[PDB]
Design a protein around this ligand. Structure first.
Ligand SMILES: OC[C@H]1O[C@@](CO)(O[C@H]2O[C@H](CO)[C@@H](O)[C@H](O)[C@H]2O)[C@@H](O)[C@@H]1O
Length: 352
C-alpha cells in the first residue's frame, strides 16, 4: 500500500478505535479507483476471532443505499415509476391520506411524517396494512423530510412487487450477483456464520433481530471487500455491464430534494464538493425540503455518503466521483456519527 495511504489511515483510525473503545474495525480506501484494506481488533471478543477482509458486519442504514439502487433498477426496467401513487402497488391502501403519496415520497422520507420505526407490535402482514392505513400524516406530501425506516422500507417492499420476486431474491439476482458481491447477504447463510462478527452494545455480544421491513430498511450484512466493490460501482456506474443496474445507480445519486446543504438521493445523500466538514455533520429531526424540479442527475463533484447503525454496529461510506476517491468504515460498535465523518474527511482530504 502507498505509504501516504498507510500513514493517514493508521494515524486517523488508531486514535479513533482507542477513544471510542471499538472492539473491531475494517476500513477500505479507494484511491484512483483501486481498493486498499485495513483491519484492527476483534470480530468476536470471547472467541478471540480477529477482524479480517472476510468478516461480515451489519451495515444497518447503509443498507438503504442498496434498497435505493434496487428501486432505481426497477424504474430502469419499466416495472415502477417514482411518480406512481403508492396505492398502485398496494391497492388495499384505501385510506384517503394516501392520495398524492407517491413512491418518490416513500423513498425520500417526504411522505408527510411516516415514523422512524414500524412498531414492534406489527408482526403479521395484516398488522402492517393496519399500521399504514391508520397512520395520520402531520404534513402534506413533499414538504418536509423525516428520516424513516417505515418510509424507505415500504418503498423497498413495493418496488419489487411487479417482478414477483421476494425482496431478498430481487436484491440477490439484480444487485449483489451482477456486481460480484458474493459475500453480501440479507440473511446470513449457515455457511458464512463463521465470519459473522458479533456487535457490541454496553459490552454485550448482539446480532440484529429484524422486525417488519427491517430487511428493506437496514438488513444487509457485508465484508470490507464487497463494500469496497460497492463504492467502486457507485463511483463509476458507467463501467457496469447490466444496463438497468447502471441507470439504477445513477438514479439513486440524483438530487430530489434539498435541505440546507444536503441533497436527498435514493438511499444516498449528497453535498456539493468541496464541502466544509462542519456541514457534513438527535432522535427525530423534521426539516422542510425544497423540491429539485426536475431532479439533478448524479453530480460528479459531490461528497456522496451514508451512515448506518444497528444496536451493535456502526458503518460509514463516503465517496467523491470527481476524484475517484472513497472510503468505507465498518465497526462492531455503534459509536457517534460525527466521529465517523471526521475520520473519513481527514483521510479523504489528505488524499485529494
Ligand atoms: O426474521 C425477519 C422476519 O421479518 C418478517 C416478519 O415481519 O417480515 C418480512 O416479510 C418480508 C419477506 O420475508 C420482509 O422482507 C419484510 O421485511 C417483512 O415484512 C418475516 O417475513 C421475516 O422472516
Amino acid at each position: 500500500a502507498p505509504q501516504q495511504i498507510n500513514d493517514i489511515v493508521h494515524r486517523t483510525i488508531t486514535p479513533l478505535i482507542e477513544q471510542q473503545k471499538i472492539p473491531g474495525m475494517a476500513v477500505a480506501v479507494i484511491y484512483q479507483g483501486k481498493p486498499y484494506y485495513f483491519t484492527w481488533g476483534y470480530a468476536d471478543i470471547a472467541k478471540k476471532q480477529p477482524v479480517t477482509q472476510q468478516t461480515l458486519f451489519e451495515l444497518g442504514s447503509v443498507s438503504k443505499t442498496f434498497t435505493g439502487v434496487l428501486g432505481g433498477d426497477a424504474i430502469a426496467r419499466g416495472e415502477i415509476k417514482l411518480s406512481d401513487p403508492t396505492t398502485k402497488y398496494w391497492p388495499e391502501l384505501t385510506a384517503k391520506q394516501w392520495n398524492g403519496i407517491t413512491l418518490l415520497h416513500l423513498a425520500t422520507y417526504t411522505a408527510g411524517g411516516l415514523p422512524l420505526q414500524v412498531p414492534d407490535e406489527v408482526k403479521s402482514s395484516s398488522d402492517l396494512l393496519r399500521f399504514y392505513q391508520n397512520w395520520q400524516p402531520a404534513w402534506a406530501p413533499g414538504t418536509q423530510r423525516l428520516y424513516a425506516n417505515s418510509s424507505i422500507g415500504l418503498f423497498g417492499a413495493l418496488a419489487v412487487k411487479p417482478s414477483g420476486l421476494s425482496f431478498e431474491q430481487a436484491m440477490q439476482t439484480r444487485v449483489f450477483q451482477p456486481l460480484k458481491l458474493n459475500h453480501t447477504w440479507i440473511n446470513v447463510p449457515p455457511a458464512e456464520e463463521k465470519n459473522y462478527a458479533w456487535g457490541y452494545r454496553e459490552g454485550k455480544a448482539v446480532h440484529v433481530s429484524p422486525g417488519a421491513l427491517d430487511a428493506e430498511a437496514g438488513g444487509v450484512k457485508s465484508t470490507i471487500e464487497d463494500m469496497a466493490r460497492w463504492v467502486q460501482s457507485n463511483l463509476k456506474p458507467l463501467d457496469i455491464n447490466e444496463k438497468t443496474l447502471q441507470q439504477g445507480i445513477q438514479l439513486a445519486q440524483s438530487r430530489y430534494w434539498q435541505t440546507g446543504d444536503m441533497y436527498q438521493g435514493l438511499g444516498w445523500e449528497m453535498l456539493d464538493w468541496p464541502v466544509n466538514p462542519d456541514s457534513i455533520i438527535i432522535a427525530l429531526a423534521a426539516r422542510p425540503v425544497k423540491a429539485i424540479t426536475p431532479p439533478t442527475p448524479a453530480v460528479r463533484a459531490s461528497w456522496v455518503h451514508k451512515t448506518g447503525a444497528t444496536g451493535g454496529f456502526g458503518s460509514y461510506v463516503a465517496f467523491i466521483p470527481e476524484k475517484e476517491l472513497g472510503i468505507v468504515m465498518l465497526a462492531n460498535k455503534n459509536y457517534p456519527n460525527p466521529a465517523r465523518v471526521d475520520a473519513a474527511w481527514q483521510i479523504l482530504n489528505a488524499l485529494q
